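@channel anyone free to eyeball this complex?
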Amino acid sequence: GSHMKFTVEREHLLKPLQQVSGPLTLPILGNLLLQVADGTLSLTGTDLEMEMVARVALVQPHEPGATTVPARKFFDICRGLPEGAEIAVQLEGERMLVRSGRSRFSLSTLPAADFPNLDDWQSEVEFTLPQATMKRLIEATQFSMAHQDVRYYLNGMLFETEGEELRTVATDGHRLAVCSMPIGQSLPSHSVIVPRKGVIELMRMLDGGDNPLRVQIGSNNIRAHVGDFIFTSKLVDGRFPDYRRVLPKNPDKHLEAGCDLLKQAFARAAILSNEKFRGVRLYVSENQLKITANNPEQEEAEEILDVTYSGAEMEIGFNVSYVLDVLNALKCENVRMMLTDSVSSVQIEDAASQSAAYVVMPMRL
Amino acid sequence: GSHMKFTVEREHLLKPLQQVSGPLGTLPILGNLLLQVADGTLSLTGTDLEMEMVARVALVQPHEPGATTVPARKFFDICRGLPEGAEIAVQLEGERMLVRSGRSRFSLSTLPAADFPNLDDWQSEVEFTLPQATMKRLIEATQFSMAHQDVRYYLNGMLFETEGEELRTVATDGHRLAVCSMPIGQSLPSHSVIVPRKGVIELMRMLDGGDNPLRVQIGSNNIRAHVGDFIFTSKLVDGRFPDYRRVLPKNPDKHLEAGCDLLKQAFARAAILSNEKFRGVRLYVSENQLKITANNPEQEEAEEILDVTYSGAEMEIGFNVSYVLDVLNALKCENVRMMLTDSVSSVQIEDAASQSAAYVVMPMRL
Amino acid sequence: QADLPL
Amino acid sequence: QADLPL
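replying in thread with the prediction:
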């Protein structure tokens, strides 16, 4: 195990190298851990909070061992080599040599023993689902996570198993997104908060393809297996809010309109909204929505849209970026807006599907 | 006219709005476009004081003459945001410009048209026409070699030169130089002018690839390009540009020929392990062989060996690898010829099959 | 901006 | 870097 050596086709190394680099301050964190043992090359990248591992089968003679090498340089060398290149790698003293054709690269290393590992842990729940389902759950809610809120538990996404469904919840205290999907298995009840950087990396590993995703959840960690990749992240502490108590109770005013027409009207009104406050005013009346925006230069935008609405007239203010984020996430034919009054949240959803729901708190304009 | 008003199809306004905004990016009115309506034409102008871009839009619907200036980004975003096929009705109302389409209404701030900057009157000394593709080739072949903020301010631009039946471009930053010439098929007078770098980039972005020919007019202190319904005008850089004829290496005694892609890929891989600041690579030329070496302060090393065609004396020469890669990326050809002298003299690099363009790179001390 | 009742 | 003789 002192003289690591392996030979691999470039085409078998490229996608694993790109993937493990995802989590990539401290010198060791800029390196990938390479480990060779009994027909497998393992490649690991970490940022101390999460780790990405890729397994590559070694079909050619190899010698066991381990080292760490600069990730970006190693990837760029392999990517820069011609299509079909054979890449021969070996440790030589404290340098890692990369050879292909008449190309030779000598890279600096840091000892494999110095590479930081996540603590040992035990899985409490396990389930398998299509990658497409996880992608849908994350994409439906990711934009509503907080970024650097003092309430740390909001800088991430809640993953919850309930009955036969997997659910995601994200909120920044102003707006909330919730999505749930049936995954054809009876599950125990569990709720964990995945850090926002972990949500982004989980999303990065979903290639759309038919390889299913296997999820393992512990008390303090989450792990996802997709093809030859294994992603592990620490979980966030704190009590995430309960979306069931955030959804507006008995909205008495239902508006329905085309998603694209509503989105384009908000997008044009936004041009003349205050750059800091982003406020727009909505006036709902019989089969009509009027959107108005003004800025400190007293420029004004006004949009009038035909909609389906027969409730009482009302005026309500919103941050237009929050409304546009919802409409951009819906990607559907028709949208339903469920209102109460000028000081209460609005619930927005696809008129044809209850799988996702969005809640936006108004502004006092 | 005191009450400007016009109605235009969105599709006729979008490309002109995007184009005239090119020079934009100090004086508040410089963030605005000048709109002028008169006898069946809407004119749109954007300027940065050094150059101006004008677009002419035929007005097929009733209109009222006049002029105003409106925020460029907001006006463009409103028009782009409207649905395909929208009719856009515009009118000045006091000190506001109203934009109406369907049941969408926008009231924009204005600044007076009387206050919009105008470049001084001038006379052209030379006029010629050429395909847009030809002007695009000349600019793209050399623009990467212009200086950015050199004190020799005449280097922060590109030389445009007419000689015989040719139009030529030259660009240099004091470390490397690019020269390209193309036939025009018109006998031209001899003229040499420096176009500011910002103007070169805007002229390049105006060349929509299409078959509309480009008409060029050059004065003593200005250049003008007419393409379709657009007119680009720029002030010239008032300085003395170097003579490329005296910069080309005299009698290079060592000729190396190799595949452009193979040479580019070998330099691109060696660059990975070059010093991040100095970017130095070492070339060792020997009988039918090129060896490229790079090392960095961590003592990491890259080595590439290539079979090439070479039969001159052995020599070692250092280069900034980004300058070499810039040339190879600009060549886009099958084979390249490198013409060398010694370790302390410039190299000339050209397409092995064409002498239309030539590149000169000064080495680094090894 | 009003706060959601979290 | 050496300078071109401009």
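from a first look: Chain C has no helices and no strands.
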